[PDB]
């Protein structure tokens, strides 16, 4: 169990995509609150943010 717990902390820590960390506690804020904005329509104000930890 203990190692399975450590594995969880490691998954959260190292689970990156395009060098962004998607699971550790850099949400709801890290050094900046900048997080996963996706720009969905062609114009401005057609936006979404995703957060997770």
């Amino acid at each position: 169990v203990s190692q399975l717990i450590d594995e969880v902390d490691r998954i959260a820590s190292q689970a990156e995509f395009n060098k962004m960390n998607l699971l550790q506690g850099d949400f709801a804020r890290g050094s900046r609150a900048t997080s996963m904005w996706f720009h969905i329509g062609p114009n401005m104000h057609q936006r979404e943010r995703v957060f997770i930890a």
Partner: protein, 237 residues
């Protein structure tokens, strides 16, 4: 305390007030005094320089009002798609970037006006006029608001040439906040070199300049060979 330490305490508080984030009472006080300079100076290009500075400060003041109104309007929306922690943070991230980006636009409009205020002061060519307290105080107020506009948005490298021009004017070098901001902005640049693995010459240049203005700010607020100075002396070694 000594007569100089009592005087110094008074002056440091006045200097901290001088660099106070803008508000409506400070706005009024500032434009009383900057107009007082227009009174004696009686120079159309100085008048134009002040007219542009005032338009720049008005941009900043109108922005501060916008930021409260925007945050108010968002707070007053019913958020029925906000049952997740991430969705609450999402909407927060929407707020912060819209507010920061709007402040960035206000900063440019304020700096375009400040740049125009400087371009008009540049047209005062007579050295007997450029050495006037009226010329120097306005130029100081333009640089101070310029420094603060950039500082608030974390644009610290950009504050260095303006802080340096600022301290060259009419004993501004004896202002504790001016050296505090220089030291902090230099510290940022030192950290940038350490994070980006930049050249050693720039690491030491920025570290040196940080320590010079750290030491001078300390000297100015506490006095030379004070327990507080003596501490900075040993660290800088």
């Amino acid at each position: 305390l000594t007569e100089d330490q009592k005087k110094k305490k008074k002056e440091i508080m006045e200097q901290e007030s001088l660099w106070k984030n803008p508000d409506f009472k400070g706005y009024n006080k500032t434009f009383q005094e900057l107009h007082q300079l227009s009174k004696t100076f009686a120079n159309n290009q100085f008048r134009l320089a002040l007219s542009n500075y005032q338009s720049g400060v008005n941009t900043i003041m109108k922005n501060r009002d916008w930021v409260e109104q925007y945050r108010k309007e968002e707070a007053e929306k019913k958020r029925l798609d906000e049952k997740w922690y991430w969705q609450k943070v999402d909407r927060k991230a929407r707020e912060e970037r819209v507010v920061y980006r709007e402040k960035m636009k206000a900063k440019q409009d304020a700096l375009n006006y400040f740049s125009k205020a400087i371009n008009h002061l540049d047209e005062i060519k007579n050295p007997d006029l450029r050495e006037r307290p009226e010329f120097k105080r306005l130029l100081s107020d333009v640089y101070r608001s310029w420094i603060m506009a950039e500082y608030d948005l974390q644009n610290l490298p950009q504050t260095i040439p303006i802080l340096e021009l600022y301290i060259e004017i009419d004993d501004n070098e004896k202002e504790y906040p001016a050296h505090k901001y220089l030291a902090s902005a230099y510290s940022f640049e030192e950290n940038m070199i350490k994070k980006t693995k930049g050249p050693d010459d720039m690491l030491f240049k920025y570290r040196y300049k940080k320590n010079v203005h750290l030491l001078r700010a300390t000297e100015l607020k506490y006095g030379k060979d004070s327990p507080e100075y003596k501490h900075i002396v040993n660290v800088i070694n």
